Write a protein that binds this ligand. Structure first.
Ligand code: 02Q
Length: 404
C-alpha cells in the first residue's frame, strides 16, 4: 500500500504545526502590550499554560492513539487547536487568552504531536530513530515558518494580530487535518521490509509504567528539559551583559534554531547506526559543559554562537532520543502509551523551567545561579542516561506454549 516515507512526511507536517503553535506567543508579546496594559510576563503565562496542557495531553493522546488508532486522535487535535487559536483571535481578556491559546490550543497540540511519534518508527524498524526525528523536526522548523508569516499579517494595514490568530489558525487546522487524515500504522501482520522455541514480546503500558527504568528516563527527561528551558531564554541577555550590542547577541544566539532543528534528524540517523546510550549520555555531558563554559565563551559573538549551537544540538536531540530509547526498552506496540506518559515530564518542565530560571536570575542579579543549576541537572541526566541499560525482554509464554 502506501510508501513508508509518507508517514515521515506526515510527521513533518504535524510537528511543524505544533512548532508554529508554540512559537506564536512571542509574535503577540508586543501587539497585546500595545492594545492592553498586559506585561510580557502576563503574555508568557499564556505560553507556559500552553506547554503544561500540551505536555500533559500527550498521555491521553497516546493512550487513545493506541486504543483507537492515531488518525482520530490527530484530526481531533487539529479541531481543538484550530478552535483555540481562532478563538484567541476573538479574545478581549487575559483569561480568555489563557483558555483559548493556553488550554484549548495546547490540548489540540499535544494530540497532534504524539501519535506520529508513535506511528512513524512502526513503518521504519530498520531506522527507528530517524523516523522519530522526522516526527519531531517540525518543532524546530515552526519558528522559521511562522515568524515571517505572522510579521506579514501583523504589519499589513487591513489586518492585525487578531488576523494572525484567525488566518494562521485556519492554516494550522488544515495542515493537522491533512496530516492526521493519512496516518495509520502498517497493517496488523506483514511488516514493510526487504530484509529483517523462545518467544519475546513488547512491553504493555502497565508493564513499562511499572518499570523503574521508565522513571529513571522520566527523571532524566525532566532534568534535561528543565535545564534547557531555564537558560535558553537567557543566552542573549548573557551576551548583552558581557558587553555585546543587542543586535550582536541576538545574531549569535540565533544559531540555536538551526542546530535545534538539525540535531533532531541527524541524531536519529547517528544513533540508528551506532546505538543510543553512549551518544545520548555524551550529549547530556556536553550540555553540562556548555552551561559551565558560557562563563568563559559567552562574551563574544563567536563564543556565544558556539554555546548557542551546542545547547540547541543537545536540547533538540532529547526529543528524538527519549522516544527512541523508550522504543528500545519497551517496543513499538505500546509506544503510544509509554511515550505519551513519558512526555508529561516535558509538560511540567515547560511549565516551570523558564519561570524558575528568571527567578534565580532576578533573585541573585547574575547568571551564575540559573546556569549552575542547569549544569547540575544536566550532570544528573548524564549520570542517569549513561547508567540506564535496557530491561530484560519479555517472555510470551502464551505464544510460547503454542509450539506443540
Ligand atoms: C519542551 C516542550 C514542553 C511542552 C510542550 C512542547 C515542548 C516542545 C517539544 C519539542 O521541542 O519537540
Amino acid at each position: 500500500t502506501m510508501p513508508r516515507w509518507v508517514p515521515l512526511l506526515l510527521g513533518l507536517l504535524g510537528s511543524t504545526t505544533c512548532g508554529m503553535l508554540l512559537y506564536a506567543w512571542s509574535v503577540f508579546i508586543k501587539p497585546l502590550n500595545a492594545e492592553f496594559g498586559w506585561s510580557r510576563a502576563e503574555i508568557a503565562m499564556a505560553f507556559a499554560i500552553c506547554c503544561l496542557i500540551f505536555g500533559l495531553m500527550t498521555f491521553p493522546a497516546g493512550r487513545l492513539s493506541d486504543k483507537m488508532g492515531p488518525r482520530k486522535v490527530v484530526m481531533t487535535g487539529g479541531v481543538l487547536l484550530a478552535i483555540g487559536f481562532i478563538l484567541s483571535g476573538f479574545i478581549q481578556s487575559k483569561y480568555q487568552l489563557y483558555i483559548t491559546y493556553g488550554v484549548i490550543a495546547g490540548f489540540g497540540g499535544g494530540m497532534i504531536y504524539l501519535p506520529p511519534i508513535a506511528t512513524a518508527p512502526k513503518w521504519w524498524p530498520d531506522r527507528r530513530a530517524l523516523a522519530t526525528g522526522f516526527a519531531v523536526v517540525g518543532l524546530g522548523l515552526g519558528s522559521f515558518l511562522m515568524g515571517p508569516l505572522a510579521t506579514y499579517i501583523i504589519e499589513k494595514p487591513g489586518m492585525g494580530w487578531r488576523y494572525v490568530f484567525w488566518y494562521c489558525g485556519v492554516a494550522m487546522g488544515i495542515m493537522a487535518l491533512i496530516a492526521g487524515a493519512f496516518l495509520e500504522p502498517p497493517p496488523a501482520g506483514w511488516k514493510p521490509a526487504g530484509y529483517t522455541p523462545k518467544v519475546t514480546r513488547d512491553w504493555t503500558y502497565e508493564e513499562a509504567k511499572g518499570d523503574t527504568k521508565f522513571w529513571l528516563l522520566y527523571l532524566a527527561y525532566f532534568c534535561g528539559s528543565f535545564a534547557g528551558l531555564m537558560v535558553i531564554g537567557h543566552l542573549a541577555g548573557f551576551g548583552r551583559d558581557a558587553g555585546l550590542t543587542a543586535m550582536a547577541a541576538a545574531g549569535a544566539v540565533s544559531s540555536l534554531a538551526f542546530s535545534n532543528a538539525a540535531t533532531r534528524i541527524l541524531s536519529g540517523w547517528f544513533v540508528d547506526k551506532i546505538g543510543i546510550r553512549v551518544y545520548f549520555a555524551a550529549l547530556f555531558a556536553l550540555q553540562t559543559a556548555a552551561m559551565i563554559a558560557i562563563f568563559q565563551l559567552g562574551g563574544s559573538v563567536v563564543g556565544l554562537s558556539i554555546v548557542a549551537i551546542v545547547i540547541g544540538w543537545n536540547y533538540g536531540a532529547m526529543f528524538t532520543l527519549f522516544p527512541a530509547t523508550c522504543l528500545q526498552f519497551y517496543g513499538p506496540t505500546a509506544q503510544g502509551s509509554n511515550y505519551g506518559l513519558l512526555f508529561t515530564a516535558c509538560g511540567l518542565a515547560g511549565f516551570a523551567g523558564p519561570w524558575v530560571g528568571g527567578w534565580l536570575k532576578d533573585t541573585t542579579g547574575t547568571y551564575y545561579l540559573p546556569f549552575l543549576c542547569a549544569a547540575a541537572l544536566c550532570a544528573l541526566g548524564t549520570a542517569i542516561v549513561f547508567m540506564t541499560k535496557p530491561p530484560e525482554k519479555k517472555h510470551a509464554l502464551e505464544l510460547e506454549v503454542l509450539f506443540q
